[PDB]
Design a protein around this ligand. Sequence first.
Ligand SMILES: O=C(O)[C@@H](CO)OP(=O)(O)O
Ligand SMILES: O=C(O)[C@@H](CO)OP(=O)(O)O
Ligand SMILES: [Mg+2]
Ligand SMILES: [Mg+2]
Ligand SMILES: [Mg+2]
Ligand SMILES: [Mg+2]
Ligand SMILES: [Mg+2]
Ligand SMILES: [Mg+2]
Ligand SMILES: [Mg+2]
Ligand SMILES: [Mg+2]
Ligand SMILES: [Mg+2]
Ligand SMILES: [Mg+2]
Lengths: 436, 437
Amino acid sequence: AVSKVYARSVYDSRGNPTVEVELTTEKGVFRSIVPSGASTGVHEALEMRDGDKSKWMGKGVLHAVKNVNDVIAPAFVKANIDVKDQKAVDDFLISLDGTANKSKLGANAILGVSLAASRAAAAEKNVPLYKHLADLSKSKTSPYVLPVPFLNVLNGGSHAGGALALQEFMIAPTGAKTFAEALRIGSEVYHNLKSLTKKRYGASAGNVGDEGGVAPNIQTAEEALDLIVDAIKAAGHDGKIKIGLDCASSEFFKDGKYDLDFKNNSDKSKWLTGPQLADLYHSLMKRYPIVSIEDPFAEDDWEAWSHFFKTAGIQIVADALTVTNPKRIATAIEKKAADALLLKVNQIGTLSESIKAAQDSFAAGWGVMVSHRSGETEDTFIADLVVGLRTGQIKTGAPARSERLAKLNQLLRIEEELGDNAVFAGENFHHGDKLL
Amino acid sequence: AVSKVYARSVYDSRGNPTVEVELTTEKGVFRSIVPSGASTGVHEALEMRDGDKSKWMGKGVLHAVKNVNDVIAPAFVKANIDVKDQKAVDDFLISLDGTANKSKLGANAILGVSLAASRAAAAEKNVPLYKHLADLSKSKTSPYVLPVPFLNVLNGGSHAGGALALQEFMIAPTGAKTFAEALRIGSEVYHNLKSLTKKRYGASAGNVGDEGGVAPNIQTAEEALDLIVDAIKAAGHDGKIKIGLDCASSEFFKDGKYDLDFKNPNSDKSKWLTGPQLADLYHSLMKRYPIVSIEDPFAEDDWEAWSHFFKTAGIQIVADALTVTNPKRIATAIEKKAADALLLKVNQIGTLSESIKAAQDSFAAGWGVMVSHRSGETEDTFIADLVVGLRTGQIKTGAPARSERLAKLNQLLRIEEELGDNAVFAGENFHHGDKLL
Ligand SMILES: O=C(O)[C@@H](CO)OP(=O)(O)O
Ligand SMILES: O=C(O)[C@@H](CO)OP(=O)(O)O
Ligand SMILES: [Mg+2]
Ligand SMILES: [Mg+2]
Ligand SMILES: [Mg+2]
Ligand SMILES: [Mg+2]
Ligand SMILES: [Mg+2]
Ligand SMILES: [Mg+2]
Ligand SMILES: [Mg+2]
Ligand SMILES: [Mg+2]
Ligand SMILES: [Mg+2]
Ligand SMILES: [Mg+2]
C-alpha cells in the first residue's frame, strides 16, 4: 500500500521553485517533479505560486507543497487506494480539490501525486513505466512506437531575449531509421547551427534560450529558417530533416490582430490580421520543409484556426487553444481548427485527464505530440509517456541542457530495451498511434 | 555480486556523446554517466573520442563504450570483486588499462564503472551514497557538512560566445544559515542578474552559456564584477554573498604571456600581460570586490607565477588545470606552495579511489577542496553526494539554471533534509569544511 506522500520545493531548469512529490510503497520511493511553463495558456489549470516578493521573487511554491503535505497526503494514505487504478487515484485527487481548474489545491500540488502513483504502479507490476502507461491508455503494443523528436534548435519569443517573435523553430529528423540515428543527425545539425549562428550574427548569438536553442537577435521568421536550412545542408542531412514551428501567437495577439514585433515601441500600423498572418505562414511553407505548425493563431481565435486549417495541408498543432483539456479539444475537433494535440500533463493536472485528452484526439483522427514545458526538470516522465501513448512525436527541447537531454537519453534507453518490438515513427509521425 | 556491466552512448548537456555505465547486482541496476570538459588541462587522463568526422562531428564515444562492453565488463564480472572495497575495484580497473594516463581503455570507459560500483556498494550497505563516500574517504561524520555552492552566474572564456576572457564569475552565499537558504538567495541574485544584464547590454546578453550563467558581450572583468555586485545589491543580499573566479588562464597563456582578448583573432600582442601584470590585475579586483576565491590564476605549468602570487594573495587560490586531480601534481603544488585548494574533478584522473586520495592529500596539507562539475554535464548527481561524503564545505556545479546543474543542487536540498540536525552548513568556513567543528 501507499504508506507515505511527501512534497518539497526543488528548482526547475530556469531557477524557479517547483513541487517535487515522493510516494512510498512496499516497492520503494517514487518521485515526480512538476514542470512549469512561461508562455502558459490562459485556460491552463492553476499553477499555485506564493506571491511573496521577498522570497524567490514571488515564485515560491510553499503553499502548493503545504497542500500536498497537509491536505492530500493524510487523505490519500487513509484512502488505501490501489496505485494500479490510475482512474481511482485521479478521481480521488480531483474530488479532494473540488474545482474544475484545480484552484483550491493547485495543479502543481495534484500532478506530482498523480504521476508518482503511476511510477509506483509500474514497480508493483514489474514493468517499465512506458509499458504501464500503454496499459493505462489501452494503446497498441505490437510494436511499440518510438517518436520523432522535434528539436527546438532556435529559440525566440518568451523563451529567449531578442527580437524574434515566433517562439520555436524545430528540426524533425523524419528521415532516420531509428531514434538513435534521429538524435545523432539532429545533434549534428544543432552543432552546425551553433557554428553558423556565431559566424552570421556574432559570438553572442550562439548562446542559448530556455529550451537550449540558439538565440540570435533576428527580426524575421525567414532569417531564422534560412539559418536552419543552412545548418541542415552544412551537416549534410538535406531531405532527412524537416521543420516544425511553434508560433505561440497568443503571446502577440492584441485587439484582434497580431504583432510580429511584440518584442519591441511596436508599430500598431504593422500589426497583422488573421488572414495576413495565414498568408505569411503559407509563404514560409512554400520555401521551407515545414511539416508542422503549432499555435499559428491565438488561444481563442477559433475562426482564424478553422480558416487556416481548411487549406494548410500539414500538421496543425493546438497548444494554448486546447490546453490538454478534453472539453476544449472537443470544441477544436468540431470546428476543425487543428489536427494534432500538444499534450502537456501540467496543463490539465492529472495523468488520467491527459490520457483522456490523447484518446479523444486519436479517436478524431488527430495526432498527439507529447511536450515538455520551458521550465523543465531532471524528471523523465514524458519520455515514457510518449512511448506509452504510441504517439510517434515528442518535443522536449534542443539537444542541449540536460533537462532536455534527460528525456532524449531516456528514449535511447527505451529504444534499446524494446529492440525488435519497437519501430521508429519516421515519416509517419502524424498517425504514430495507427502505425501498423 | 556484480552480474552485469553495460555501457551505452548518451548525450551530455552540450549535445556531445558521452559514456553511461549500468552495473547490476542483487540490489538492482546502478547508473553512472561520465562528464566532459571543454577547457581541459593538458595533463588530464585520456578522454577517448572516435574522431570519425562523419558521426557526431568526430566526438563519438563508441570506442570507449566498446572498451566497457567488450573489455571491462567480462573481466569485471569474472573477477567478482566486493563493490564495498572501492580500492580493490579501482586497482582492478587501473590494472586492466595498464597505462599512466588511462590511454589503453580511456578514462571515460573506466570512470563509469568506478562510480557505479560505489552506488552499488551504498545499496548493499543500505546507506545513502554520501554516507558511503564518507566511509571510503574516512571523513568525520559528526556532523556532516553541507557545502557553500559557488554558483557560476556569468559565463565567459571557453564556456560562452563573447569577448570575455575570464571563464567563470561565481557567487558564493557564505552568509546563509542553511544550504536551502544559500540556494534560495543565490537564485534571487541570479534572477536579478539576468534582468540587469538585459537592461545594460541588451536582451541577447541574458541568454546563457554552457554552465547556465549569463553571457554578456563584454570585454573586462571589472564590468562583469560590477554586474554581479549590482545584482547582489538589487536582490538585497549585500554582505551575505561573496565572489569566486575561475580565470582558466591556461586558455589564454602564450609565449609566457596572458592575452585577455584571446577569442578575438585580431588581438593586439602589445596588450598581452606578463605574470606580474596579471597578479596586479587580480589584486586590483580583490580590493574592489568581495572576492574570496580565485581558480587557475596562472597557467597549468607556470609554477613560479603561482608561488609568487600565493605568498601575498590572502584568499583561497584553487588549482584546477595545474593539478588535474592528480596526487603526483598535487604533491608538487603543495611543495611549491602554489595554491591552497584543489578543484576535484573525478574524470580528470579517472577513478573514485584516485580522486579520494587527491582530496586526502590536499586536506593533509591544510588545503581546501572544491568539488567540481565539468562544463559538459549530465543528469547524474554523483558530485552532490561526493561533496558531502568528502566534507569539503564547497562545491561548484553551475548557475542555478540548466538542470544538469540543478540536478546536483536539488540533490543537495534532499541530502540536507535527510540529515536534519546531523548536518551543518559550511558558510564562512567553506575553506576548511573538512576540519569544521
Ligand atoms: O509553448 C510551448 O509549447 C511550451 C514548450 O516549449 O513552452 P511553455 O512551457 O513556456 O508554454
Ligand atoms: O574549468 C573548469 O573548472 C571546468 C568546470 O567549470 O570547466 P571544463 O569542464 O570546461 O574544464
Ligand atoms: Mg507556451
Ligand atoms: Mg501491457
Ligand atoms: Mg490568404
Ligand atoms: Mg506551444
Ligand atoms: Mg477534468
Ligand atoms: Mg577547465
Ligand atoms: Mg559511515
Ligand atoms: Mg604586484
Ligand atoms: Mg577551472
Ligand atoms: Mg594512479
